[PDB]
C-alpha cells in the first residue's frame, strides 16, 4: 500500500488521482482528529461508483503506515513557510520508526530545502529520499511552449535543471518540439517569455485562485508512483541529495535521474556549456541559502 | 465541451476526475474573478504531466458556455456543521434561479445535471426556470445512494462492492429507501444474506452517510457527487442507454406528476429516454408515497418566486 | 509476473488486452520454437508506441515461469482426448516450476480440462480455476440488452451448471435495472436469449471459422485484475466441488469469491427443485465428459 | 463512428485495442460473408465483460460506412505484392469515396508510401485526409532498441525518423535524445549503427520467428492516430503524406513529421537537415519514386 501524509489540498488531489488509477490500496494519515477518516470515507464512496476495488482508509495513527512501499509526503503548509522544516523533522522520526525501508517523495516547499531536512533526519539512503521538482517544471514549460506554437504539449521535450524556485532554469539548447530544436522555432524574446511564465507559474496561481499549486504536484506524484511500481528505469528530473554529481555534494538540486522499484538508480549529468554551468551554480547557491536560514538543529 | 458551473469544492473534484478520463474539453465558470482561471491553470499543468491532450479553461463570462453538450451544475453552497436545513434550501434555490437564466440564454440545447442540495428541490426550481424539458434537467441522487448502500453492505459481508446490486428510490434525503426484495449480492437475494435489523443498519449508514463525513472532516461530501458526474458524462457521450436512478420531474410515472423524485431511468445522448417503474408491493408503495411528500414539503417551503 | 502458456489465438488476444492495462510484466511460453519470441517482439513495439513500460518476453523454455504468481493456460486447441493430453503435459511443467501460483485454464471443454489439471497438478482446490462463467453471463447480458435496447451494464445475469450444452441461466435471480427479468420478458423471449447464449460460441465458429478467442481473453483480464486487487469479488467459475451443491469430486460452473490467493469460498445459491434438476443434469454432463478420458488422464 | 476495412490480422488487433479504449463505435467491413459479423460478435461479448458500452458491428456492405469520421484501411495482403495490394486500394478507394465523403482515411496496408499514393489519387480527397501509417512505428521500434541497450524506459527516449517505411527508412541521431541527453553523446557511431539494424530488420525478424508480418505495431499506432484526431490534439507525428512542395519535392509520398488534428493534417514540419541528411532523404524519395512506377498506369493514375 501507498501511504499519504497530509490530508490537505495537495494530499487529497493525490488521493483522488491515485484512486482513479487503482495502483494499490492507499492510506490517509493526518494529525487533525477525524479529518483523514472523514475524507477517506467520501473518497471510498467515489471509488464505489467508479468501481475501483482498491481499499481506501484514513487514520490519525502514524504507526499504521507500517508496511508501506511508498510514503508520499505532502503534509506541508501552503502559500497565501520554512516552518515546514519542523513538520518534516517531526514526520522524519515517524517514518524512520514505521517505514524504514520505504521510498519517500516530498511535495512540501521549499522542496529542495525540505528534501535536505528529511534526508538528514531519516538517515535514509539518498536513493530513497526524493524531492518532487522537475516533472512539474518540465510540464509547465511544455505547456507554455505549446500554447504559443499551437501544438500539443505531448510533443514538446523540455529540459530543466537547478532547483524548484526563483533560480530554476530551463535548458533550451536541449529542448525541442516534434524533433525540431526549440531555439529554431522561437526568437530569444519568445524563449525568455516562456521561461518567465514557467518560473512564475506557481506564484501566478496563487495570485489568481488564492492558494498555491496542488493538482500539479498531485499529478506528478501519480507518475512517480507508476514509475516505481513498474520498475520502469525512467529518466525524470527530481530534487536529490548530491554526492559529487554535477561537481557538488552535501547539497540538494533538481537533476535528471533514473528512478526504479527501489528508488533512484543513478543521477544523469547533462552535457552543459559554461553558461548553463553558471546558471546551475546559481541554483545550488540559492538552495544554499535556504538551508543556511534553517536552525542548526534542523540541519 | 463540458462546462462546470462552480469552481468550488465539488466542482473542482469533478474537473480533476474528468481531466483524468479525458472525455472531452472542459470549461470552468465561476463568478469570483481569477478563481476559475487560477484553477484551470493548475489543472492544465496537471494534464500536461499526465499527457492528457484536452483543453481546460476558466472564465468569469457565462457567455462562454455556448456550444456545450453538457452543463454540470455544482454552484451551490454545502451544509455546514451546526447548520439549518431551510437555511440552505432558500440560498441554493436563489443560486439555481440565477444560473437558470444563464443556461436559458447560452446553452438551450445542453443537458444539465445538478448536484446542489437539496437536489430534488433544486432540480425542481431549475426545471421550472429554464423552460427545458424533463428529459434534459437531471438531478444527481440515486447513483451515490446506491454506491454508499453497496459500500456498507460490502464492508459487512467481506465482498467487493462491485458484486453488490443495490436498488434505491424516493428522494435524496431522510425518506430515501432501498428495495431489499429487489437487491442482491453475487446473485444472492439480500434478504437471505442479511437479517432485517442488519439491513436497516446499512440503510441508516447510507441515509446518514453524508452527515457523518461533514462532522468528521468538517465539510459536506464532494468526491462522491463528483464520481457520480463522471458516470453520467460517460453514459451520455456513449449514448449507452444505461439505467441509473436520478431525481427527475415526474409526468405520470409511478402515478405522480408535477413533482420530483429519485427514480430509475434510461440515460442516453439526448438525456432521459424513459423512466423505469419497478414492480412494488403495498409497503414499498407507501414508502415511495412518503418520499414524494417530503419533496412536496421542500418545494412548498420555497418562495412562490423561486418555484412559480 | 503473469505467465501465458499458449501463444495461440486466445493466448495472443489475452496478451494484447493484458498489455493495454499494464497490470504486470507478461511472459509468453509456447512449444513451437520462434513463435513466442516473434510475438512478444511485435507486442513490445506496440507497448512502446502506447507508452506502457511493462516487460514483455517470449520463450520455449517452461522453467522461465518460476516466480509467476499467476499462470494463464490458454494452450488447448479448439478434441477432447487431445486437449486432455495437452493438459496432462502442461500440468507437469506447472507442478515443477509454479507450485505457488494460481492457474486459470481457458482450454475447452473447460470443466473436463479443469478436472484433469486438478488431478495431475495436485494443487489445492482453490488455485486451479477454470474460466467459463464470466463469459456466459456477459453473453446472456449481451443478448438481453440487444433485445431491450438498454446497456448490458445495466443487466444482472446469473448462470450455473457447466460451460456447454447444459449451461443454464437462473432468470428468477437475474435482473435489469432492478426489475426482475420475468416482468420484462416472456417465456418464449427468455428462451430465445438462453438459446442464443448457449449457442453463441458455436455461431461465431460457423461465421468466422475459428472458435471464440476475445471473450475468454477479456474474461482473463477481469480474473487477473480480481486476483491482483484482492477484491473479494463474486464471479462464476468452473471449480472442483468438495460437497457444495451436494456433489464432490467433479467440476461445475458455480459462483465463487475470488481473491489474491485464488478461490476463497463457493457461494451456494438458494435454488428451486427445477433449478436443482437443471444443475444435476449439468453435473451429469461433465461426468460423461470425464468418463470418456482414459484412466491415466483422470 | 470508426470504420475498419479488413477483418484480418492487423484489422482485428486494431479493433481489440480500440475497444479497450472505448473512444467510439466500431464497424467491421470485409468481403467474406460472416467473417466480420462473427468477429464483431466475439468482440462484442468481450466488450460486455469489460463493461465498455460501445457498439460493435460487422458487415459485408460498404454502404454501411456512411457517417464515419475515421476510416482505417488494413485490407492489404502481407512486385507480386505491390500490384495485388494496389489493386486492392483502388477497389477500396471507390467505395470510401462514395460512402465516407467526409472522411479521414489511414492506410496500414503496405507498401504505404505506394499505397497512400494510390488511395490519394483514386479517392480525390485533399492531402489533409489521406494519411499513411509509418513513422510512429519506426520511432517506437528505434526507441525500443535504444532502451534495451541503455537500460532505461523507452518513454524516456526521443527517437526521430524520416524517409519512408522500408529500407530507406532513416533516423536522425543529432535531434534524438534520451532523458534530455543527446544520443550522440551516450553512444558511439558504431553503437547507433547497431540500433538501426535492429530497427530496419525488426519487421523481417518478426516474420521469420512468428511466420507472419507485424500486426500490433501498426494497430497500436492506429490507436494513437485515432486519439490524436478525436482530441484535436495538434500533435506532431511522422506520417507518410502526399507532398506538394515541402522538403523541395512534389507528387510523391514520403514519411515526414506533421501536425495531426480533427480535420486531418494541418501542416507538415520541415526539419533543419544537414547535407548528408538531405542526401539520405533523397534516396528515400527515389525509392518510393520507383516503387510507384512499378505499377500499372491503370492503378497508379
Swiss-Prot record, chain A:
Optimum pH is 11 for malate oxidation. Signal peptide: none annotated. It is an enzyme of class 1 (oxidoreductase). The keyword Oxidoreductase applies. GO terms for biological process: lactate metabolic process; tricarboxylic acid cycle. The active site is at 164 (proton acceptor). NADP(+) binds at residues 6-11, 84, 107-109. Keywords: NAD, NADP, Oxidoreductase, Tricarboxylic acid cycle. Substrate binds at residues 79, 109, 140. Its EC number is 1.1.1.299. InterPro entries: L-lactate/malate_DH, Lactate/malate_DH_C, Lactate/malate_DH_N, Lactate_DH/Glyco_Ohase_4_C, Malate_DH_type3, NAD(P)-bd_dom_sf. It catalyses: (S)-malate + NADP(+) = oxaloacetate + NADPH + H(+); (S)-malate + NAD(+) = oxaloacetate + NADH + H(+). One of its GO terms (molecular function) is L-lactate dehydrogenase activity. Optimum temperature is 95 degrees Celsius. Catalyzes the reversible oxidation of malate to oxaloacetate. Can also oxidize tartrate. Can utilize both NAD and NADP. Catalytic efficiency for malate oxidation is 3-fold higher with NADP. Belongs to the LDH/MDH superfamily. Ala at position 30 is responsible for coenzyme specificity. Asp or Glu is present at this position in most NAD-specific enzymes. The next residue, Arg, is important for NADP binding. Homotetramer. This is Malate dehydrogenase. It comes from Aeropyrum pernix (strain ATCC 700893 / DSM 11879 / JCM 9820 / NBRC 100138 / K1). The gene is mdh.
Amino acid at each position: 500500500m501507498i501511504t499519504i501524509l497530509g490530508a490537505g489540498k495537495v494530499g487529497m488531489a493525490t488521493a483522488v488521482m491515485l484512486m482513479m488509477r487503482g495502483y494499490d490500496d492507499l492510506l490517509l494519515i493526518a494529525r487533525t482528529p477525524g479529518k483523514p477518516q472523514g475524507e477517506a470515507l467520501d473518497l471510498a464512496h467515489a471509488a464505489a461508483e467508479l468501481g475501483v476495488d482498491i481499499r481506501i482508509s484514513g487514520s490519525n495513527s502514524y504507526e499504521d503506515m507500517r508496511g508501506s512501499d511508498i510514503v508520499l509526503v505532502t503534509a506541508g503548509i501552503g502559500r497565501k513557510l520554512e516552518a515546514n522544516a519542523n513538520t518534516m523533522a517531526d514526520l522524519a522520526e515517524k517514518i524512520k520508526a514505521y517505514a524504514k525501508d520505504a521510498i519517500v517523495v516530498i511535495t512540501t516547499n521549499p522542496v529542495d530545502a525540505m528534501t535536505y531536512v528529511m534526508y538528514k533526519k531519516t538517515g535514509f539512503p539518498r536513493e530513497r529520499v526524493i524531492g518532487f521538482s522537475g516533472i512539474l517544471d518540465s510540464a509547465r514549460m511544455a505547456y507554455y511552449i505549446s500554447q504559443k506554437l499551437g501544438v500539443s504539449f505531448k510533443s514538446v521535450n523540455a529540459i530543466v535543471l537547478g532547483m524548484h524556485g526563483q533560480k530554476m532554469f530551463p535548458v533550451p539548447r536541449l529542448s525541442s518540439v516534434g524533433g525540431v530544436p526549440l531555439e529554431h522555432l522561437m526568437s530569444k524574446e519568445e524563449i525568455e517569455e516562456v521561461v518567465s511564465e514557467t518560473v512564475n507559474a506557481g506564484a501566478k496561481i496563487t495570485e489568481l485562485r488564492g492558494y498555491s499549486s496542488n493538482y500539479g504536484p498531485a499529478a506528478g506524484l501519480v507518475l512517480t508512483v507508476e514509475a516505481i511500481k513498474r520498475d520502469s528505469k525512467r529518466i525524470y528530473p527530481y530534487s536529490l541529495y548530491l554526492q559529487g554529481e554535477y561537481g557538488y555534494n552535501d547539497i540538494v538540486a533538481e537533476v535528471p535521474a533514473v528512478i526504479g522499484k527501489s528508488g533512484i538508480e543513478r543521477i544523469i549529468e547533462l552535457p552543459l556549456t559554461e553558461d548553463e554551468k553558471r546558471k546551475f551554480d546559481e541554483a545550488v547557491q540559492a538552495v544554499k541559502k535556504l538551508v543556511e536560514t534553517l536552525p542548526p538543529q534542523l540541519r
